[PDB]
Each structure stands twice: as C-alpha cells, then as structure tokens.
Amino acid sequence: STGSATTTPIDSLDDAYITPVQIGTPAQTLNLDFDTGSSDLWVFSSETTASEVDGQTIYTPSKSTTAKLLSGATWSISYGDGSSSSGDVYTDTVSVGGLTVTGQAVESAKKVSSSFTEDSTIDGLLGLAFSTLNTVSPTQQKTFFDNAKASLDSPVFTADLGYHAPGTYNFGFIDTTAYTGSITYTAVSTKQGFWEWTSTGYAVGSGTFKSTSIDGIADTGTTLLYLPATVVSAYWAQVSGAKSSSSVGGYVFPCSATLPSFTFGVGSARIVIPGDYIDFGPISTGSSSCFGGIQSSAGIGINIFGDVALKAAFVVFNGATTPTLGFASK
Numbered sequence: 001s002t003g004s005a006t007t008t009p010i011d012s013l014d015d016a017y018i019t020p021v022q023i024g025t026p027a028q029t030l031n032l033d034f035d036t037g038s039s040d041l042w043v044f045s046s047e048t049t050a051s052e053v054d055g056q057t058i059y060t061p062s063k064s065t066t067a068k069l070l071s072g073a074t075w076s077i078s079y080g081d082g083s084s085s086s087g088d089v090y091t092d093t094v095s096v097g098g099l100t101v102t103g104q105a106v107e108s109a110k111k112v113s114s115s116f117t118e119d120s121t122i123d124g125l126l127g128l129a130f131s132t133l134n135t136v137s138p139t140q141q142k143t144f145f146d147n148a149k150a151s152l153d154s155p156v157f158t159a160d161l162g163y164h165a166p167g168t169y170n171f172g173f174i175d176t177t178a179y180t181g182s183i184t185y186t187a188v189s190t191k192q193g194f195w196e197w198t199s200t201g202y203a204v205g206s207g208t209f210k211s212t213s214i215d216g217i218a219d220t221g222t223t224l225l226y227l228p229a230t231v232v233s234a235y236w237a238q239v240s241g242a243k244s245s246s247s248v249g250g251y252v253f254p255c256s257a258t259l260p261s262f263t264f265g266v267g268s269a270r271i272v273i274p275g276d277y278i279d280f281g282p283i284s285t286g287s288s289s290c291f292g293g294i295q296s297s298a299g300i301g302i303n304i305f306g307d308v309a310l311k312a313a314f315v316v317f318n319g320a321t322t323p324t325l326g327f328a329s330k
Contacts (some may be wrong), residue, residue: 001151006035007161010121013281014307015223017161018121019169022095023106024064028055030123034169035221036159036195036317037304039133039143040077041094042085042107043124044116044287052112055120067092073095075107075135077296080222080300085112089136094144096126099171101148105134105141125221128157128317133193145171145319155319159181160218160330161311163277179314179328184269188323192302194219195317197325199305200267202227204235205260209270216303218325219313223281225262225273226297226304235262235294242292248283251292262294264309266327273312 007019018031023043030043044053046060061067068092077088087110094104109124116122127134130144149155152172160178161167169180189196193218201211214227232251236242238260242253253259259275278293295310316326 001148002153002170003095003148004168004170005097006166007169008166009162009164010119012164014161014164014311015050016119016122017167017220017307018123019096019126021126023059024061026064027095028057028059028064030048030059031121032124032126033221034126034128034159035124035219036128037217037219037221038077038079038125039127039129039131040075040076040107040135040194041105041124041126041144042075042077042109044112045087047087048109049111052117054117057123059106059108059124061090061092061096062104064092065081066102067106070105070136070139070141073105073136073139073315074139076137081115083113083115085109085116085297087200089141092301095168096144096171097169099148099152101144104144104147105136107136110280126232128220129195130190130193132190145317148172149319157317157319159310159315159317161220161307163274167311179330181329183314183316183326185316185318185324185326186266188320188325190323194302195226195323195325200265202231202265203263203270204238205275207238209263209265211265214264214303216297216305218258218310219306220310222304222306223308224304224306225294225308226300226306227294227305229296230296232294232296235260236292244296248289248291250295252283252289253292255288255290257290264305269327271309271327271329273309277308279311
C-alpha cells in the first residue's frame with residue numbers, strides 16, 4: 001500500500017505545516033502537525049477542557065463506531081518549546097492520504113497548554129519519530145508509520161515541505177519526479193529515539209564550505225534551524241546589523257536586509273537553503289527588526305534540522321531494518 005497527502009503552511013511565515021488526517025467511522029478529519037521529532041498521535045477532542053479549546057476541530061470518539069477506549073492508558077508529553085498536553089487513549093481507524101491503519105492509538109487530550117489553545121489551525125500532532133519515545137502508559141503504543149510499515153510497498157515515508165506553499169508527505173514510495181539529481185543517504189542513530197544524523201559541514205552564502213561534523217535531528221515539528229553557536233555566529237556576521245537579542249530570544253536582523261543562503265552537507269552532497277527561507281518576519285507587528293530562521297542550539301542540548309532546513313530538500317525517512325535518511329535537492 002501507499003499514501004499521499006498534501007501538507008500546508010499554517011500561516012504566511014511557514015510557522016508549521018498541517019496535514020489532513022481521517023480518524024474514526026464515519027471519518028472525522030483533523031488537521032495534524034506531522035512531527036518527526038516525537039512519537040505520539042494526539043488530538044483535540046470532546047474530552048479537552050472546554051476553556052482550552054479555541055477554534056480547533058475536535059475528535060469525538062463517542063461518534064466513531066470503531067473507537068475503543070484503551071483501558072487504563074494515559075499519556076502526557078512536554079515539547080522542547082515548553083508546550084505540553086495530556087489525556088487518555090482510544091484505538092481507532094486512522095487514514096492519511098489513502099493509507100489506512102486499524103487499531104491506531106489516538107491519544108485524546110484532556111489538557112493542553114496555552115500555546116496549543118492559542119493556535120486554532122493545529123488540531124493535534126502525528127508523531128513520526130521512533131516508537132520508543134511514545135508516552136502512553138502503562139503500555140507504550142506504536143506510531144502511525146510503525147503500524148503501517150509492514151503493509152507499505154517500501155518501508156519509507158518522505159517529507160517535501162514547501163516554502164510559502166503546500167507540499168507533500170508520501171508513505172510507502174519515493175516520487176522520483178519530486179526532486180532533482182540523486183538522493184544522498186546518510187546513517188541514522190536511533191539511540192535517542194530521533195532521526196539523528198551527522199551533517200558533514202556548512203557554507204554561508206558564496207563562502208567556502210567548512211568540513212565539520214554536526215550531529216542533529218531531522219525534525220519536521222520544529223520551525224527553525226538550530227545549530228552550534230559558532231556556526232550561527234558565522235552566518236549572522238554576514239548580515240549587516242544582525243545581533244543576538246536576549247530580550248527577543250535569538251538573532252534578529254534588519255527587515256531591510258537581503259539574507260545570504262546557508263548550505264549544509266549530506267555526505268559529499270550539499271543542500272542550499274535560500275536566504276529568503278531564513279526570514280521569519282517582524283519580531284512584533286510593524287517592527288523593522290526581523291526574526292532569524294537560523295538560531296543557536298546552545299540552550300537545547302541537540303542540533304535541530306527543522307523546517308527551515310528540511311523545506312530546502314526532498315527528505316526520505318527510511319524505516320528499513322537499519323534506518324537511514326536521504327536528502328535530495330528539488
């Protein structure tokens with residue numbers, strides 16, 4: 001089997017991407033944030049505290065003839081940005097782009113933190129990291145991809161995120177019309193539960209490539225590109241007036257600037273992020289100070305190849321017995 005679904009930016013800055021997902025019988029369609037950095041499929045629901053729902057579409061398990069309460073199971077998750085959610089668990093039928101899993105754990109939120117409430121466009125998350133990170137207790141549950149893998153034509157999914165435009169998540173096949181050149185595959189460590197790999201270095205604009213190993217994670221659920229402070233300083237030094245602002249929380253730059261590109265290495269191959277992809281717009285409405293899309297990972301503990309990086313590539317998440325990642329230009 002295969003599936004194919006369009007993923008769409010939630011706003012004009014590509015702050016996140018949403019993908020429609022059918023849950024239950026009859027189908028209830030929710031727009032979920034596909035997140036290769038976590039492993040829980042959770043939704044706003046009829047059980048979510050009413051004051052914490054503000055415009056999201058909710059899953060109502062009592063209206064699904066295939067929903068079954070997973071007795072005794074709870075979940076609770078905290079994300080790197082400080083947001084969180086928790087609740088109980090149903091199993092139900094879940095379809096993405098024509099690909100159907102029966103018995104998928106659907107984690108129904110009883111509580112969500114304020115940033116989720118405040119984002120009316122995201123109805124939940126669909127985790128695509130490794131199932132070892134799933135938070136369901138006392139019986140850990142599998143991701144959608146893990147449940148579908150055996151049925152897929154090939155045990156892979158691909159992310160093709162657009163810049164200020166829709167893109168595509170495919171399951172079970174590699175669309176050879178969606179990229180240029182070849183796909184370069186690189187080793188993955190699953191020891192932390194992430195799609196963790198080592199970039200071979202970087203360049204800033206037309207500058208010379210620096211060969212240096214950068215361990216990090218391919219994370220569709222993180223908006224920006226978080227890299228070591230040395231790398232980030234070298235980038236922003238090429239932008240007149242750019243500075244790190246402790247009060248704003250990262251590098252900012254004059255909105256009048258034209259940003260240089262940023263290149264990262266995948267083995268001997270190179271992925272070029274155009275300068276425009278690194279502009280996240282005014283820090284507050286009407287400001288002439290703009291927020292940068294490349295930020296330091298120094299306070300995270302891990303480097304994160306988020307959407308800023310991934311949207312410049314066609315990315316293969318290869319879930320073969322030994323997982324790997326593939327990157328192509330597009």
